[PDB]
Amino acid sequence: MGKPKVLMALYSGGKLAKEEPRLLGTVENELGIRKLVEEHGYELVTTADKDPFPSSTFDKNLPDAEIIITTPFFPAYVTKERIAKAPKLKLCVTAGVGSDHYDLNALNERGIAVLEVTGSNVQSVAEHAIMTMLILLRNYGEGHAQATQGTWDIAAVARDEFDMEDRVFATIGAGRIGYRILERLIAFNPKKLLYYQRNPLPEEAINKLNAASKLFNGVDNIIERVENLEDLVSQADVVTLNCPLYEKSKGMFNKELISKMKKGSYVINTARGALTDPQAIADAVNSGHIAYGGDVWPVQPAPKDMPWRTMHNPYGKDYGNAMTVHVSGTSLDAQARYANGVKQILTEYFDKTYKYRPQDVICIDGHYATTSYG
Amino acid sequence: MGKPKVLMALYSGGKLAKEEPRLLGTVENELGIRKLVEEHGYELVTTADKDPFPSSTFDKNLPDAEIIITTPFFPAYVTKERIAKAPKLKLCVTAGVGSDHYDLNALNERGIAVLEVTGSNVQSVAEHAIMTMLILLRNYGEGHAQATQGTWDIAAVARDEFDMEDRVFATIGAGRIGYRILERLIAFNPKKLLYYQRNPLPEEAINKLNAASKLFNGVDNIIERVENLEDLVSQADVVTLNCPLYEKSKGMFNKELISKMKKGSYVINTARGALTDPQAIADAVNSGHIAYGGDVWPVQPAPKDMPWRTMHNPYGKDYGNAMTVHVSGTSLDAQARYANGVKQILTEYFDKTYKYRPQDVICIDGHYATTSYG
Numbered sequence: 020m021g022k023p024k025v026l027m028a029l030y031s032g033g034k035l036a037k038e039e040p041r042l043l044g045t046v047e048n049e050l051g052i053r054k055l056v057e058e059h060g061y062e063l064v065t066t067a068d069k070d071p072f073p074s075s076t077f078d079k080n081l082p083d084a085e086i087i088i089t090t091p092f093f094p095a096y097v098t099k100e101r102i103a104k105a106p107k108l109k110l111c112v113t114a115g116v117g118s119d120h121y122d123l124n125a126l127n128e129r130g131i132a133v134l135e136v137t138g139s140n141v142q143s144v145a146e147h148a149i150m151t152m153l154i155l156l157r158n159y160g161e162g163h164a165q166a167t168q169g170t171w172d173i174a175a176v177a178r179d180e181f182d183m184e185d186r187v188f189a190t191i192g193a194g195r196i197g198y199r200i201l202e203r204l205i206a207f208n209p210k211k212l213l214y215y216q217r218n219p220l221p222e223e224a225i226n227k228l229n230a231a232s233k234l235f236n237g238v239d240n241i242i243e244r245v246e247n248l249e250d251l252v253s254q255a256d257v258v259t260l261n262c263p264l265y266e267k268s269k270g271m272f273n274k275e276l277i278s279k280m281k282k283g284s285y286v287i288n289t290a291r292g293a294l295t296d297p298q299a300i301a302d303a304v305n306s307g308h309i310a311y312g313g314d315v316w317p318v319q320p321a322p323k324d325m326p327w328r329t330m331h332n333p334y335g336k337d338y339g340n341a342m343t344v345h346v347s348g349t350s351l352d353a354q355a356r357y358a359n360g361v362k363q364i365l366t367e368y369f370d371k372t373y374k375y376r377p378q379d380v381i382c383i384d385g386h387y388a389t390t391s392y393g
Numbered sequence: 394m395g396k397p398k399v400l401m402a403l404y405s406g407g408k409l410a411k412e413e414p415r416l417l418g419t420v421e422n423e424l425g426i427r428k429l430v431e432e433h434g435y436e437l438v439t440t441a442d443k444d445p446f447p448s449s450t451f452d453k454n455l456p457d458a459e460i461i462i463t464t465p466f467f468p469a470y471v472t473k474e475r476i477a478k479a480p481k482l483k484l485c486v487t488a489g490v491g492s493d494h495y496d497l498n499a500l501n502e503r504g505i506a507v508l509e510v511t512g513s514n515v516q517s518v519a520e521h522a523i524m525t526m527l528i529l530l531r532n533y534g535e536g537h538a539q540a541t542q543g544t545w546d547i548a549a550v551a552r553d554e555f556d557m558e559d560r561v562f563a564t565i566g567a568g569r570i571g572y573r574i575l576e577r578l579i580a581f582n583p584k585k586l587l588y589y590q591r592n593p594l595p596e597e598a599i600n601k602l603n604a605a606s607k608l609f610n611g612v613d614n615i616i617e618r619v620e621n622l623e624d625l626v627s628q629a630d631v632v633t634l635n636c637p638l639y640e641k642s643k644g645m646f647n648k649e650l651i652s653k654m655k656k657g658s659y660v661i662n663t664a665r666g667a668l669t670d671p672q673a674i675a676d677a678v679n680s681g682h683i684a685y686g687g688d689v690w691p692v693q694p695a696p697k698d699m700p701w702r703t704m705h706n707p708y709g710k711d712y713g714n715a716m717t718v719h720v721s722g723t724s725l726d727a728q729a730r731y732a733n734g735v736k737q738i739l740t741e742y743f744d745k746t747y748k749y750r751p752q753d754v755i756c757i758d759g760h761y762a763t764t765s766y767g
């Protein structure tokens with residue numbers, strides 16, 4: 020019978036966040052939304068203590084949580100069991116983009132509204148995917164290692180060092196992030212750009228890439244839709260995952276699909292870790308069939324023993340692994356965007372106007388409100 | 394009174410090169426030019442033993458060297474002293490691009506011709522410079538470290554993690570590589586692109602970037618020439634070096650010029666290591682004033698104790714250092730290009746037609762033949 024609770028789970032930044040106000044996505048700085056939440060008579064409970072269910076600080080504040088705020092880089096998994104003891108939950112907001120860590124179906128069954136700050140990090144992840152591509156293709160790991168450990172073995176680096184130019188790049192998903200990856204690839208003079216999704220790209224999108232290809236490289240018709248998944252990964256040197264975890268996309272990048280790729284190919288996954296068969300990825304990196312890079316993991320924070328943390332090609336420890344901890348969507352520039360985004364969503368809710376941006380809505384009124392989840 | 398000698402100094406790749414025929418830039422594979430050299434009655438002496446002067450295999454074969462072939466990634470320093478005991482030297486060819494390791498003035502005084510495979514690696518280095526930018530700005534080092542050493546400290550990565558978008562990129566040199574860096578930056582939505590050289594860019598080059606800016610980002614007039622060097626580095630978040638080591642460019646990026654940059658700026662140098670004051674770079678990285686990345690060093694191979702091998706920002710060992718061993722110009726795709734390039738230069742010379750590509754000529758007939766050196 021207390022005040023209504025806003026329960027927010029973010030990662031902790033300690034003294035770093037206390038001295039860097041731009042680290043808004045931290046428990047310390049609370050996205051800057053404390054004044055607003057208290058202006059409207061709500062109790063703001065912010066915590067980084069999100070696991071051991073059901074003993075966490077997060078779990079213990081579920082019974083009076085009206086609004087739940089999470090963040091994908093350090094995500095409180097809002098499962099059916101947890102939704103079942105949050106009886107007055109009305110709204111879930113993701114501080115960022117990516118809401119697979121909710122049980123969206125159980126939330127619909129309760130009429131729960133689910134919002135994201137769609138578009139706050141689309142450019143940031145696209146930069147991360149391009150960086151990953153460049154790091155793997157050009158063998159930055161061994162090139163940096165040679166400089167770090169005092170030697171000068173040019174041939175060890177160059178033996179696995181390829182240009183981006185004249186490679187074939189394929190993307191599973193040409194949405195906001197996927198398409199933005201294609202855009203930044205054009206000036207690298209690819210041999211061909213492939214894409215695979217359930218609907219064909221718009222025309223002016225195909226025309227924009229072809230126009231860019233013509234201006235930069237004098238090449239035309241560089242983009243092409245492949246409709247068979249095995250056919251897409253067979254033709255490509257580099258495949259990026261830029262689609263969502265939507266149930267039948269569970270584990271789609273499995274042992275068989277990896278086997279259909281050329282030996283020495285590259286897999287980038289800044290989308291969702293669970294799109295892959297995680298051990299099949301590790302097997303294929305450690306065998307040298309592929310190199311792998313990305314920042315999303317199947318379980319976050321990732322276990323110490325997670326096989327992706329020690330994957331490498333046979334050539335050496337610094338060959339073929341460009342993993343990072345989940346950071347692309349939470350650069351300082353991105354954090355400013357989605358902190359302001361969470362503030363606008365809460366303002367609309369508190370003022371009881373609910374004039375949300377429609378692209379921000381993931382679930383509402385008991386139904387999905389987007390193709391990005393299901 | 395033996396046959397005339399072709400003296401070639403390349404790096405060694407051992408069993409790697411013996412099993413990878415694409416490693417043409419190695420002693421093992423000899424650029425594929427042995428048949429041609431012997432077809433014309435020449436003795437091909439290939440060696441990776443290039444230092445201790447005057448005792449090296451390289452030095453000991455100078456007295457009968459007619460053609461000298463070097464490579465910048467592992468360069469035999471053809472100094473005045475060494476030219477003085479190569480009395481029948483006629484031609485020096487660089488297996489790649491970058492000929493600062495010759496004494497070009499002493500070669501002119503002898504009428505020595507000096508050739509490069511201009512353009513063989515322009516795209517490869519531009520990819521390396523962009524990769525370096527992305528690695529430093531986005532804090533890949535700590536992001537990769539966190540994943541490697543079993544932890545999950547999101548805030549440590551994000552505290553120094555910025556987007557490429559809305560940053561100001563400045564290039565010292567808008568030649569083939571510099572301009573190609575600008576081209577690949579456009580789709581990253583920069584705030585502004587600056588450049589600094591002795592002559593203004595052509596018009597259709599300015600128009601190509603502005604056209605690309607308009608198509609991708611809806612922005613116009615994105616390129617701008619700055620004429621004061623301190624003024625260029627004051628305004629920029631990222632400055633790339635893409636000009637040559639031409640005597641008064643010796644040590645230009647010194648303590649003072651670094652001090653004029655904003656704290657937390659970035660310096661990329663895929664050009665020549667000696668463009669910088671090397672210890673001033675180390676001082677400014679270790680103090681955190683800048684981050685630094687690149688693959689060229691003042692002395693190659695770099696000493697074990699070279700300060701750039703252990704530079705890092707105060708935040709940690711994996712902050713602010715993106716050094717690699719000199720590899721960008723020697724990717725497998727690049728090696729195929731400049732091995733064929735060295736073959737054409739030798740064909741023209743052996744057939745005594747000398748129909749060299751004019752862009753390949755660095756010195757000839759006692760004079761410089763390019764603005765890229767002097």
Ligand SMILES: NC(=O)c1ccc[n+]([C@@H]2O[C@H](COP(=O)([O-])OP(=O)(O)OC[C@H]3O[C@@H](n4cnc5c(N)ncnc54)[C@H](OP(=O)(O)O)[C@@H]3O)[C@@H](O)[C@H]2O)c1
Nearest residue numbers: 116117192193194195196216217218262263290347348391
């Ligand atoms: N690493 C990070 O920090 C970070 C940050 C934000 C987001 N993300 C991840 O990136 C993902 C999407 O990014 P976004 O916001 O750009 O998504 P988006 O804008 O919704 O675009 C997704 C695209 O993927 C396509 N797609 C959907 N299901 C597919 C399937 N099964 N196979 C192939 N293509 C499919 C969709 O087209 P059709 O509907 O026509 O198939 C759509 O065009 C999110 O799910 C999230 O997991 C990561």
Ligand SMILES: NC(=O)c1ccc[n+]([C@@H]2O[C@H](COP(=O)([O-])OP(=O)(O)OC[C@H]3O[C@@H](n4cnc5c(N)ncnc54)[C@H](OP(=O)(O)O)[C@@H]3O)[C@@H](O)[C@H]2O)c1
Nearest residue numbers: 490491566567568569570590591592636637664721722765
């Ligand atoms: N890392 C690698 O593997 C690798 C491979 C190849 C080359 N490189 C390096 O990259 C350098 C050049 O690359 P490139 O082949 O693209 O050269 P380039 O085509 O000759 O272009 C050089 C540009 O720099 C400008 N410039 C010359 N001197 C300058 C100065 N003092 N200050 C500012 N700008 C100046 C020139 O314009 P103005 O004459 O109008 O000033 C010219 O436009 C080479 O010197 C080499 O050291 C590295």
